[PDB]
Amino acid sequence: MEMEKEFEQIDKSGSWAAIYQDIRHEASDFPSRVAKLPKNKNRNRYRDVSPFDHSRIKLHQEDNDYINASLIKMEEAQRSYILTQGPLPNTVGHFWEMVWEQKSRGVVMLNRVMEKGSLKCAQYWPQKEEKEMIFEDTNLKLTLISEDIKSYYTVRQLELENLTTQETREILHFHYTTWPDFGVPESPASFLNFLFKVRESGSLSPEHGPVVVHCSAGIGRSGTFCLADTCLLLMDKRKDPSSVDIKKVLLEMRKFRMGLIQTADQLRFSYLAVIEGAKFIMGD
Numbered sequence: 001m002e003m004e005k006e007f008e009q010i011d012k013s014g015s016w017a018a019i020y021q022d023i024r025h026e027a028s029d030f031p032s033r034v035a036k037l038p039k040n041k042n043r044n045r046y047r048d049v050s051p052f053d054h055s056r057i058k059l060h061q062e063d064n065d066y067i068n069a070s071l072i073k074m075e076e077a078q079r080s081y082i083l084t085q086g087p088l089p090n091t092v093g094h095f096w097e098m099v100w101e102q103k104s105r106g107v108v109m110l111n112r113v114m115e116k117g118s119l120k121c122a123q124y125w126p127q128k129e130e131k132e133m134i135f136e137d138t139n140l141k142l143t144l145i146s147e148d149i150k151s152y153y154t155v156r157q158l159e160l161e162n163l164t165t166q167e168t169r170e171i172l173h174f175h176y177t178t179w180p181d182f183g184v185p186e187s188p189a190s191f192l193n194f195l196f197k198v199r200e201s202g203s204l205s206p207e208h209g210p211v212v213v214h215c216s217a218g219i220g221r222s223g224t225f226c227l228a229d230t231c232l233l234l235m236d237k238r239k240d241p242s243s244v245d246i247k248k249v250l251l252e253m254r255k256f257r258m259g260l261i262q263t264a265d266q267l268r269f270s271y272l273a274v275i276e277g278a279k280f281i282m283g284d
């Protein structure tokens, strides 16, 4: 079926939970043996969220190459994403090592450091220009260059230096600051505006490594971001945009990381975002 009328048909029939449970039943199951090794317990935020072995990102290190991060490679859309958990106190150096080694331009953050009164990720970037961060375990230096605070999101320019080689690179940090503690946003307008700002920066383009996107577990809000981006790109590429099937795209992405889209409310929100976004693209 088309999307916008499939949408009204699920709303009127109140069957979002059943649609979402079907997706959960059909999703891929692949091994995640490296994630479960005892030496990696303090590298995982949640025991039930792990990268598959076949798609996990490897650190260029001979001691322990493990990070909780997955490569999502979308062949028809010609887009790739790295989805990862919010960094932990003992993985902030690994996180920036990955950014460096994978040649990423941008980092997309969809959570606040504290939500619901608890810490959802480490403070992994510097908050003042004159107070830089040094990660001694991976030999990197990170400096805040500029910060632009808007009503729904903040963009930061960061400088990452590999202290072994003295090479430097500019990284863009895109921080969506207004996702509610409970539920999903009422309108997708600010989330779509944010997606378009990431696109306009070059961070999603083939001349760079894959964008790094995270929330707390790296599967819920993060899944919503890449699902909406990929669906909108397919609608622009194909002769028949109404052939884009959001449930089929989601099952393809779940071949590369488990659990993408965590609730039936997130599924409904993803439909809403793609529907509204397809009107703004046109040709309108």
Ligand SMILES: Cc1c(C(=O)O)oc2ccccc12
Pocket (backbone or CB within 6 Å): 002, 235, 241, 242, 278
């Ligand atoms: C014409 C059209 C429809 C439709 O027939 O509903 O859905 C789309 C999505 C993207 C671009 C064009 C379309």
